[PDB]
Symmetry: D2
């Protein structure tokens, strides 16, 4: 089992659009032990389900919008995993998601929050030379925040790399989810990108979770600063031809 | 075992600089069955070693400089793997490597040869919806051929993707090899890139073989058209600071 | 004269690091008529100098940190240039420039403010099919905002392009300025990038102003969505060799 | 006049698809003096027209497929411009344009030929610190050669930059030409890219010639290693929406 005895903080299971569930599943499946976070005791029920399914070591409240909340969270993770001979974290997964305030809010929750976790997790990640992984999704001021987030990956890979901490991102294609499906205008992106993308389909959540597993695993120990597109080739694509 | 019963043509073991050995090792290690090629009955000895170590199903002469040689090779692979109920190939690995003739020769051996294998392997790759993987290395007219090769990855991912064939590349950092080491001027790139790269080291061959395994494996089934840098973050790096 | 009778709002002359002065100079030199903005009646003196040197049609207070300030500014520009048979603007130049608040503030002033001007200027820019130009500079959370800003260029080029409005950016290399010079640690970037860059020098402000002129001029009428590096080749550069 | 007394070798007027004509026109218009080349005394008539229209200082046979032909050409240009107090060249314009042989041929004529001219022109370009400009066009093994050519721009900018020689490329959008128009399948790219591109049109030859003028002119003296897209924003574009 690829991750026997390895420890991962997974943040974002509260959202049905995040793919964090599939990442947790992929990680669990290979023997990792997981601590999952919930942003709000209002949105805790889905996380408890995962906790249940995945044998979560703990379930800790973390709102990635506030440094203090993050600090408290990491104080708690430190209690579980920041003691012992074999103290430390193998990975931290960040899988979260107009006026200036809309922009400000996008950048804060989507982009800065990743730097915020990296800071809070550095000591523990350093202890086991673990990695950070963020997700990005493929139209608004979320384009600006996407770009922002991907730039933090390069800065962080460079600033954390001296401690042996890898930092990487997956860029996920459009995925067909329930509910996401019943929008009828998101439905229509999926219809189109299925025809656009080289593989002529949309990626599954399983494909994203397995790519995430890879980046978080020993197999990816030579890889840092990377944006891995998991999108059936959508991003690389070129011209309509007859559409 | 991730690749139980999966079939991979690995081309380039003849070169001590290719990393093809480590890729074969990584693949074997996870239960794949391998057919390795040699460019010349003059350079067959190293391949026979690998054949030996890896239990190669066959060892077939292929000079990636000639379409006919490639055709013959694929006629032979067809005999082993192009018959049965479960006919087909899971992957083909292309891990090969001033006047206009030097440029012409670089482009031919380094870049076009990859398209040449894709063509020859399409039917078999289609049969099992398998993938193609090429390697690129990180200064000459090899820069031009690198760029050429990476562009073929996007074209091929797009042209082959309708058949369910994925097409991807790894871009490998400077690696410290024996002999490669005793050059004393390549030695010095390695010295520098170790200080440059975020992780403060050069990647190992193991790291490249495992990243290759990943891209060739079911875990990467949502990924096509990708250039995966395996280089300890070298490529992403930004400014000297105090060097 | 390339810009006879053309109208340009230039924002950022208040900063001695912005290069907005040189852009204004370049524009004036070719016959454009200019309205320059100042963020604060505290920082108005430098702008009045330029107003003086360049024959500014007006000098209007604009703080790019507030939508209302921007609105008022554009109400005023509308009074000068939003009436007549030949109403409209030929260009708008945006040449402006750790905790989450530092990030928030960088993104707001550096990145969103550009979208804010585009919105406020759209009607007038549309009237003459004019363009927007922003500047970017080449290490902090300013990397994240840089990336953010450059992504707004693509979104805006796409959203404004149906009205015939072009949207482009210059990315400026390290420039040797007075004061900027007397920092002794910025001094040292300049020393290094002079040795790094292909041309073996740093670009002048004149070189940036002339590239800006170009992008704002009829000569660039086929160009939108572009990031033009004006940096003596610094960005494109590859490996130390012997440093 | 921006180019009074400046000297430019323009190669590619023989082709009706090259846009070299418009570049020559743009250059002439600003007072440059031109030497135009023809690949073949069979395809000399169009060049003589331009020679006529533009007051060409000479008209010299150059087949960019052969080093010797290029050498002879440059021996001749040396006779006109490689003597005097003010010896040298202000610019050289390279505006030229399946089996392995098709690939080999694409790379040779499209990509290496640019390096070949740079070599032959270096001494003269150095003498006046002039620049090189190549064109690229926007599906075959021409994609591979495009990528190849753009990589030569970075290598050459870096290798020639110590002599004060700038090296840049324009990437031109689909242009509606006569004849090119009467193809009925190229016609249809133009129809589509007009709807795709942000500006909702295809660029003109005038727009490409003026962008070329810029890069070759003193205004672009801070710019090297650049790929300038002149394509009404086509390249930057993102997703169909409702097509
Ligand atoms: Ca990548
Ligand atoms: Ca560019």
């Amino acid at each position: 089992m690829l991750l026997k005895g390895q420890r991962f903080v997974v943040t974002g299971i509260a959202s049905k659009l995040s793919i964090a569930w599939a990442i947790a599943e992929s990680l669990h499946r290979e023997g990792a032990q997981l601590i999952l976070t919930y942003p709000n005791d209002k949105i805790k029920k889905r996380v408890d389900m995962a906790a249940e399914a995945f044998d979560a070591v703990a379930v800790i409240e973390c709102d990635v919008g506030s440094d203090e909340s993050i600090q408290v969270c990491f104080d708690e993770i430190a209690k579980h995993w920041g003691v012992g001979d074999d103290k430390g974290i193998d990975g931290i997964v960040h899988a979260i998601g107009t006026t200036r305030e809309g922009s400000q809010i996008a950048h804060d929750i989507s982009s800065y929050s990743f730097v915020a976790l990296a800071k809070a997790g550095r000591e523990l990640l350093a202890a086991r030379q673990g990695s950070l992984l963020t997700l990005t999704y493929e139209y608004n001021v979320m384009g600006m925040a996407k770009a922002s987030l991907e730039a933090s990956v390069r800065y962080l890979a460079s600033s954390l790399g001296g401690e042996g901490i890898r930092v990487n991102a997956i860029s996920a294609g459009p995925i067909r989810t329930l509910a996401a499906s019943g929008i009828k205008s998101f439905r229509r992106m999926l219809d189109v990108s299925e025809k656009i993308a080289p593989l002529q389909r949309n990626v599954s959540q399983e494909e994203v979770g397995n790519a995430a597993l890879f980046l978080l695993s020993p197999w990816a120990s030579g890889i840092t600063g990377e944006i891995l597109f998991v999108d059936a080739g959508f991003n690389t694509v070129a011209i309509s031809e007859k559409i």
